[PDB]
Amino acid sequence: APMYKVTPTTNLVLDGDTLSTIKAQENQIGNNLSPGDTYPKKGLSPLALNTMDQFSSRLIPINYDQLKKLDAGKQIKLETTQVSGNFGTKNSSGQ
Amino acid sequence: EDLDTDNDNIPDSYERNGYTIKDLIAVKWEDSFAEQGYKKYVSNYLESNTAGDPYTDYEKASGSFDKAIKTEARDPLVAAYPIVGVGME
Amino acid sequence: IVTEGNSWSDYISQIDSISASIILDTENESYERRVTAKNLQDPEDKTPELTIGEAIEKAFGATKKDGLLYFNDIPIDESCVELIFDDNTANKIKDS
Ligand SMILES: [Ca+2]
Ligand SMILES: [Ca+2]
C-alpha cells in the first residue's frame, strides 16, 4: 500500500554511540511513495538530511573526539527506527 | 435505460455504448451529431471517476469544472493532471 | 461582509482563460478590463457574441453620440485613437 507524507526517523551511530535521532522536516518529506517505488524516484539524486531542529535552521554537530575517529578510517551507520505516514479514504462528497 | 450504478448523472447503457452532453443532460450518441461539433464519450459504468482525477464523469463530460482546464481533458478517459517542473537559469 | 477566506487567486486563472484583455491608456490615467469571449468550437458555449466595438463600449462605459463612442469627452473611435496589438491578435484580426 502507498504511504502519503512519509516522515521517517533515523539514528546516526559512529562506533556504539548514537550521535542523534532526527525526525524528517518539511524539506525531507515525501508526498507519495507507491509500492515498489522510491523517493526520490529512480534516476534522481538522494535527498540531503542535514538539519536537526524542527524548523530546519540548525546543523548537526559532532564532537572533536568523534571527528578524530571519523577522519581516522571509521565510518558512520544509519538506522531507521520508525516511519509515520497517511492513507487515503473517501469523504462524504467523493474526494 | 435509466439504471444508474456508479451514481453520477449518466445511465449505465449510455456510458457503455456512447453518450454526449448537450443542454447539461446526457443523451444517446447519434452519428449525425458529429458535424455540429459534438464528441462521443465512453466511460466506466461501475466507477464514478473513470480516470481517477478529482472530477467525476459528469463534471468532465459536461465541462462543469474549473474553466482553465484544457478542453482535451473533458473526456472521462483523459485525466486532468499537471506536470509542473522547475528549471534553473 | 466577510473578506477572510475569499481569495482572488481562485478566480484569476478561470477569468483570464475565457476573456480578452483591453487596456485604454488616456493621459495621466490607465484602465484595464476583461471582457468575456465566446468559443465557436464548443456548441454548448451559450455566451453572447460581441464585436470589438461593443466590447469597448461595455468595458469602459462609453456612450454613443452619432455612432461613435466617447469615453467622457475624448473620442475613442478607431480612426481617432492608436490601436496596438501583439503578433497573435494582429494575425487573427488581419485575416478577418
Ligand atoms: Ca452512471
Ligand atoms: Ca462512470
Side-chain angles (χ1 to χ4, degrees):
Chain A
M3 170 168 285
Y4 305 101
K5 218 170 159 237
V6 200
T7 318
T9 301
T10 69
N11 299 7
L12 303 174
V13 286
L14 186 40
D15 226 343
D17 273 29
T18 297
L19 263 52
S20 55
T21 71
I22 306 145
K23 205 219 190 153
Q25 272 95 253
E26 293 276 353
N27 297 5
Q28 318 112 18
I29 275 176
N31 308 317
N32 299 109
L33 201 55
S34 277
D37 279 7
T38 169
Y39 178 76
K41 279 207 220 69
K42 160 169 247 206
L44 297 195
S45 314
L47 71 90
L49 165 84
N50 72 346
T51 41
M52 87 162 217
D53 79 322
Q54 174 154 342
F55 300 127
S56 311
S57 80
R58 218 256 190 256
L59 312 176
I60 317 167
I62 59 182
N63 217 0
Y64 190 73
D65 260 306
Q66 273 144 20
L67 161 86
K68 189 170 299 321
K69 22 177 167 163
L70 250 185
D71 90 7
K74 206 154 261 208
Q75 275 161 319
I76 217 164
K77 295 292 177 255
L78 184 130
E79 289 134 11
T80 176
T81 40
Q82 83 208 299
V83 175
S84 35
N86 297 327
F87 61 92
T89 63
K90 321 292 187 50
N91 54 327
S92 187
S93 319
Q95 323 280 309
Chain B
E1 300 100 37
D2 65 317
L3 173 53
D4 214 328
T5 308
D6 46 338
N7 255 265
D8 37 4
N9 273 18
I10 323 172
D12 281 42
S13 78
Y14 287 16
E15 291 184 48
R16 196 160 38 234
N17 289 307
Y19 67 99
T20 202
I21 300 268
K22 83 197 316 195
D23 214 300
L24 291 180
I25 40 168
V27 293
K28 319 187 28 174
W29 167 256
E30 298 133 44
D31 251 17
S32 81
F33 281 164
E35 42 210 281
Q36 313 309 98
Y38 287 106
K39 298 236 173 46
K40 204 191 151 196
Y41 296 142
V42 282
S43 324
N44 184 356
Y45 78 102
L46 282 182
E47 204 97 50
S48 202
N49 296 59
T50 316
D53 45 338
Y55 320 106
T56 83
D57 296 347
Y58 184 72
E59 278 156 28
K60 299 186 64 189
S62 93
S64 211
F65 45 54
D66 197 4
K67 294 298 158 168
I69 302 184
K70 279 184 141 23
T71 172
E72 69 213 35
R74 308 238 308 237
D75 46 327
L77 291 200
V78 173
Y81 180 66
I83 321 290
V84 186
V86 173
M88 174 157 90
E89 301 187 355
Chain C
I1 283 183
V2 287
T3 60
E4 202 81 13
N6 294 345
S7 209
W8 276 113
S9 292
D10 317 335
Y11 299 104
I12 280 183
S13 293
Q14 196 210 27
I15 272 166
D16 286 21
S17 155
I18 68 188
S19 307
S21 40
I22 311 194
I23 305 132
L24 184 94
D25 206 336
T26 171
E27 77 162 332
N28 78 281
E29 186 83 330
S30 194
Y31 309 79
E32 179 155 343
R33 305 274 176 274
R34 305 261 184 294
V35 192
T36 308
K38 170 188 209 331
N39 216 18
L40 287 151
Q41 309 321 287
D42 197 24
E44 293 286 307
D45 193 354
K46 307 280 163 248
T47 315
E49 215 177 80
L50 281 193
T51 69
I52 306 197
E54 315 158 289
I56 294 189
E57 184 202 356
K58 274 194 217 283
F60 307 102
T63 59
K64 283 200 214 50
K65 157 167 133 179
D66 294 326
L68 321 166
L69 311 157
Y70 282 109
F71 181 43
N72 276 318
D73 209 351
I74 317 105
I76 68 173
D77 176 30
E78 38 155 341
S79 49
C80 328
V81 286
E82 203 183 348
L83 263 51
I84 295 191
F85 321 93
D86 39 357
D87 313 328
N88 214 339
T89 308
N91 267 328
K92 294 192 41 73
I93 215 166
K94 195 171 136 257
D95 74 333
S96 193

